[PDB]
Scaffold this active site. Structure first.
Site, PDB file in Angstrom:
ATOM      1  N   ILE A  10       0.818  -1.200   0.000  1.00  0.00           N
ATOM      2  CA  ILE A  10       0.000   0.000   0.000  1.00  0.00           C
ATOM      3  C   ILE A  10       0.853   1.250   0.000  1.00  0.00           C
ATOM      4  CG2 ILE A  10      -1.776  -1.235   1.295  1.00  0.00           C
ATOM      5  CD1 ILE A  10      -1.123  -0.148   3.730  1.00  0.00           C
ATOM      6  N   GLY A  11       2.164   1.067  -0.111  1.00  0.00           N
ATOM      7  CA  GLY A  11       3.074   2.131   0.283  1.00  0.00           C
ATOM      8  C   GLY A  11       4.529   1.734   0.195  1.00  0.00           C
ATOM      9  N   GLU A  12       5.357   2.735  -0.076  1.00  0.00           N
ATOM     10  CA  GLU A  12       6.801   2.575  -0.119  1.00  0.00           C
ATOM     11  C   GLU A  12       7.297   3.924   0.365  1.00  0.00           C
ATOM     12  OE1 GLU A  12       7.702   1.145  -4.324  1.00  0.00           O
ATOM     13  OE2 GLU A  12       7.509  -0.788  -3.288  1.00  0.00           O
ATOM     14  N   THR A  14       9.701   6.561   2.620  1.00  0.00           N
ATOM     15  CA  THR A  14      11.129   6.741   2.386  1.00  0.00           C
ATOM     16  C   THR A  14      11.942   5.597   2.974  1.00  0.00           C
ATOM     17  OG1 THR A  14      12.225   7.970   4.209  1.00  0.00           O
ATOM     18  CG2 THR A  14      10.596   9.176   2.858  1.00  0.00           C
ATOM     19  N   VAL A  18       5.393  -0.338   2.910  1.00  0.00           N
ATOM     20  CA  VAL A  18       4.187  -0.521   3.711  1.00  0.00           C
ATOM     21  C   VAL A  18       3.230  -1.533   3.094  1.00  0.00           C
ATOM     22  CG1 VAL A  18       2.325   0.599   5.006  1.00  0.00           C
ATOM     23  CG2 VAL A  18       4.334   1.949   4.243  1.00  0.00           C
ATOM     24  N   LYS A  33       4.956  -1.629   8.334  1.00  0.00           N
ATOM     25  CA  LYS A  33       6.067  -1.009   7.605  1.00  0.00           C
ATOM     26  C   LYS A  33       7.362  -1.725   7.960  1.00  0.00           C
ATOM     27  CE  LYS A  33       7.154   3.487   6.070  1.00  0.00           C
ATOM     28  NZ  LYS A  33       8.467   3.698   5.351  1.00  0.00           N
ATOM     29  N   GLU A  76      -2.030   1.451  12.777  1.00  0.00           N
ATOM     30  CA  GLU A  76      -3.437   1.561  12.417  1.00  0.00           C
ATOM     31  C   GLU A  76      -3.621   1.598  10.888  1.00  0.00           C
ATOM     32  OE1 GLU A  76      -6.829   4.809  13.044  1.00  0.00           O
ATOM     33  OE2 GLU A  76      -4.855   5.463  13.761  1.00  0.00           O
ATOM     34  N   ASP A 122       8.496  16.076   7.785  1.00  0.00           N
ATOM     35  CA  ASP A 122       8.289  15.660   6.417  1.00  0.00           C
ATOM     36  C   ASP A 122       6.832  15.432   6.042  1.00  0.00           C
ATOM     37  OD1 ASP A 122       9.294  13.006   4.272  1.00  0.00           O
ATOM     38  OD2 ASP A 122       9.158  15.162   3.890  1.00  0.00           O
ATOM     39  N   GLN A 126       0.869  12.346   0.795  1.00  0.00           N
ATOM     40  CA  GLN A 126       1.027  10.903   0.918  1.00  0.00           C
ATOM     41  C   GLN A 126       1.047  10.391   2.356  1.00  0.00           C
ATOM     42  OE1 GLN A 126       4.484  12.085  -1.645  1.00  0.00           O
ATOM     43  NE2 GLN A 126       2.740  13.422  -1.181  1.00  0.00           N
TER      44      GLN A 126
HETATM   45  N1  F18 Z   1      -2.851   3.252   3.319  1.00  0.00           N
HETATM   46  C1  F18 Z   1      -2.817   3.162   4.644  1.00  0.00           C
HETATM   47  N2  F18 Z   1      -3.841   2.799   5.402  1.00  0.00           N
HETATM   48  N3  F18 Z   1      -3.479   2.838   6.584  1.00  0.00           N
HETATM   49  C2  F18 Z   1      -2.219   3.189   6.751  1.00  0.00           C
HETATM   50  N4  F18 Z   1      -1.679   3.314   7.955  1.00  0.00           N
HETATM   51  C3  F18 Z   1      -1.732   3.422   5.463  1.00  0.00           C
HETATM   52  N5  F18 Z   1      -0.622   3.793   4.828  1.00  0.00           N
HETATM   53  N6  F18 Z   1       0.498   4.188   5.133  1.00  0.00           N
HETATM   54  C4  F18 Z   1       1.139   4.381   6.268  1.00  0.00           C
HETATM   55  C5  F18 Z   1       2.383   4.954   6.034  1.00  0.00           C
HETATM   56  C6  F18 Z   1       3.260   5.217   7.064  1.00  0.00           C
HETATM   57  C7  F18 Z   1       2.857   4.898   8.349  1.00  0.00           C
HETATM   58  O1  F18 Z   1       3.719   5.185   9.363  1.00  0.00           O
HETATM   59  C8  F18 Z   1       1.604   4.338   8.579  1.00  0.00           C
HETATM   60  C9  F18 Z   1       0.717   4.055   7.553  1.00  0.00           C
END
Ligand code: F18
Length: 293
Positions: A10-12, A14, A18, A33, A76, A122, A126
């Site tokens: 769901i995420g990359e 830095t 994720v 993460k 969460e 930061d 996003q």
């Molecule tokens: N798409 C998402 N749903 N819930 C998240 N926590 C999430 N995405 N990213 C992060 C990204 C960094 C983080 O510390 C916590 C969640």
């Protein structure tokens, strides 16, 4: 790890990937993460401080799992980020009442963190995550100081400069909570106009985009600027534009507030706590977004 079934990426950020994951005990669905790197103890110690910095507008840090060269942070889960919502909302924009609600809530998140002397450093669309009930929450709070901020992510994708405060760009090493107010001001302007305010593609470009809109700073507007490490006398000297040109159709209270959040001098820039008292928020409400997950 072990205890989590990964269900999708769901995420990359830095620092690493994720994943949406399910806890094989609790039932619970989380964002996991996996931070690449054994692990340096100061960062462990710093991250753990974060487990107590809880606020309804800060994405809850559920657990920290250190195992090998292996640091997993279990957060969460929220079902989208503001950049996706903004992209989704592009044809009409986010309605102003919702923009206002989101800004109000982020400021609350910031007031909280700032009152415990924790900076984000930061903020970016996003890492602002939203849910179906009209909440928005700050993610990755405190990770910059625990680790660093790199010029590239673990993936080599470039870290965005678009939200960086000018005192960071000018080389100030000891910057304050004001840097998050700058970032959130850029994000407020972007929500209103549906275009990034200062989309720099290098540090000099970012700085010159700031100067081009707000005026090249001098000793009048910013005492001490010309002594900053990366300040040069040779910067071009551009005139300040009116905000009315910069964030149409924001009203006068909105423009007043944004201007205070984008003060050059980090000392004069509005605090989160003071921003929450601004007349802009006099008629704030908590609308529900239309969200197509
Ligand atoms: N798409 C998402 N749903 N819930 C998240 N926590 C999430 N995405 N990213 C992060 C990204 C960094 C983080 O510390 C916590 C969640």
């Amino acid at each position: 790890m072990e205890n989590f079934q990964k269900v999708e990426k769901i995420g990359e950020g830095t620092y690493g990937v994720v994943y949406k994951a399910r806890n094989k005990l609790t039932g619970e669905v989380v964002a996991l993460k996996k931070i690449r790197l054994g692990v340096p103890s100061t960062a462990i110690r710093e991250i753990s401080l974060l487990k107590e910095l809880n606020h309804p507008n800060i994405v809850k840090l559920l657990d920290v799992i250190h195992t090998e060269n292996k640091l997993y942070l279990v957060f969460e889960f929220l079902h989208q980020d503001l950049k996706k919502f903004m992209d989704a909302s592009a044809l009409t924009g986010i309605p102003l009442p919702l923009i206002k609600s989101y800004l109000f809530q982020l400021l609350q998140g910031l007031a909280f963190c700032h009152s415990h002397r924790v900076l984000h450093r930061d903020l970016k669309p996003q890492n602002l995550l939203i849910n179906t009930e009209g909440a928005i929450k700050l993610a990755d709070f405190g990770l910059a100081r625990a680790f660093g901020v790199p010029v590239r992510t673990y993936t080599h994708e470039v870290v965005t400069l678009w939200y960086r405060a000018p005192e960071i760009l000018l080389g100030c090493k000891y910057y304050s909570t004001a840097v998050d107010i700058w970032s959130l001001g850029c994000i407020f302007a972007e929500m209103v106009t549906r275009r990034a305010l200062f989309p720099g593609d290098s540090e000099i470009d970012q700085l010159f985009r700031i100067f081009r809109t707000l005026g090249t700073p001098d000793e009048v507007v910013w005492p001490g600027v010309t002594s900053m490490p990366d300040y040069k006398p040779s910067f071009p000297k551009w005139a300040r534009q009116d905000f009315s040109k910069v964030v149409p159709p924001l009203d006068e209270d909105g423009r007043s507030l944004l201007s205070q959040m984008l003060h050059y001098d980090p000392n004069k820039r509005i605090s989160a706590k003071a921003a929450l008292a601004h007349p802009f928020f006099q008629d704030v409400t908590k609308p529900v977004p239309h969200l197509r997950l």
